[PDB]
Design an enzyme around this catalytic site. Structure first.
Site, PDB file in Angstrom:
ATOM      1  N   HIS A  80       0.836  -1.187   0.000  1.00 22.90           N
ATOM      2  CA  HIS A  80       0.000   0.000   0.000  1.00 22.90           C
ATOM      3  C   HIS A  80       0.883   1.255   0.000  1.00 22.90           C
ATOM      4  O   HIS A  80       1.971   1.287   0.635  1.00 22.90           O
ATOM      5  CB  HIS A  80      -1.078   0.022   1.109  1.00 22.90           C
ATOM      6  N   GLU A 152      -3.623   1.492  -7.990  1.00 24.14           N
ATOM      7  CA  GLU A 152      -4.057   2.717  -7.299  1.00 24.14           C
ATOM      8  C   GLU A 152      -3.161   3.950  -7.570  1.00 24.14           C
ATOM      9  O   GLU A 152      -2.089   4.072  -7.000  1.00 24.14           O
ATOM     10  CB  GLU A 152      -4.097   2.513  -5.775  1.00 24.14           C
TER      11      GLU A 152
END
Length: 235
Positions: A80, A152
């Protein structure tokens, strides 16, 4: 057509759990709730929906990975954006982490994505391919059954600036083609490539309609009831 879709929540919390539990989902979708260890137990025992699964956010080491299993957590979110930015997690480090998770029978959600700078510099494709390629270096064909790719754009995470559908699809298509060419059509065909970054209840449906989008990784909107709408956009 598309493989089974995923709707992932990246973490009132009990209120949401209650809401999720009362929620009827009638299509084939895999829902996931990723949490901090802090709220792992709670979620672990409050969440009872059949279509939901819980996921951990990070595992320091072997011992940590084992304890997760002992606890019933079979999914994990890796790479992430904040990890890559502030936790010294390079491409290679993430790749290694992805592999170690896989080796322990985990289902993994590996995140990739460019920065605004990389995006302005017209370096998106390369960045993305570079990140995925480092991942692919430590997996073997069979391991791909345990991986989920979350694309992302860093500039879209928590910003309110979502990628247009055209952006997303272009990104997803790029990834898939590389997968298909470097790994194999069968794998490619089966791979779930999620979109993440300011998804909400209004923008979800259009994103999901893109040929290469298999679901989402949702932060902000997951702390709200709109999440349910997010889940429905995968119908």
């Amino acid at each position: 057509s598309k493989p089974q879709p995923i709707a992932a929540a990246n973490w009132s919390l009990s209120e949401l759990i209650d809401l999720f539990n009362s929620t009827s989902i009638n299509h084939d979708v895999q829902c996931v709730v990723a949490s901090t260890s802090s709220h792992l137990a709670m979620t672990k025992e409050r969440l009872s929906h059949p279509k939901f699964v819980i996921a951990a956010q990070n595992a320091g080491n072997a011992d940590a990975l084992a304890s997760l299993k002992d606890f019933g957590v079979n999914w994990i979110v890796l790479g992430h954006s904040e990890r890559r930015a502030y936790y010294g997690e390079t491409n290679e480090i993430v790749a290694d982490k992805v592999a170690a998770a896989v080796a322990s029978g985990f289902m993994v959600i590996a995140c990739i994505g460019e920065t605004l700078q990389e995006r302005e510099s017209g370096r998106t494709a390369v960045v993305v391919l570079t990140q995925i390629a480092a991942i692919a270096k430590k997996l073997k064909k069979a391991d791909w059954a345990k991986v989920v790719i979350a694309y992302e754009p860093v500039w879209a995470i928590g910003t309110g600036k979502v990628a247009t559908p055209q952006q997303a699809q272009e990104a997803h298509a790029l990834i898939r083609s590389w997968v298909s060419s470097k790994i194999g059509a069968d794998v490619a065909g089966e791979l779930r490539i999620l979109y993440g970054g300011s998804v909400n209840g209004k923008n979800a449906r259009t994103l999901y309609q893109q040929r290469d989008v298999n679901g989402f990784l949702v932060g902000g909107a997951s702390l709200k009831p709109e999440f349910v709408d997010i889940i429905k956009a995968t119908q």
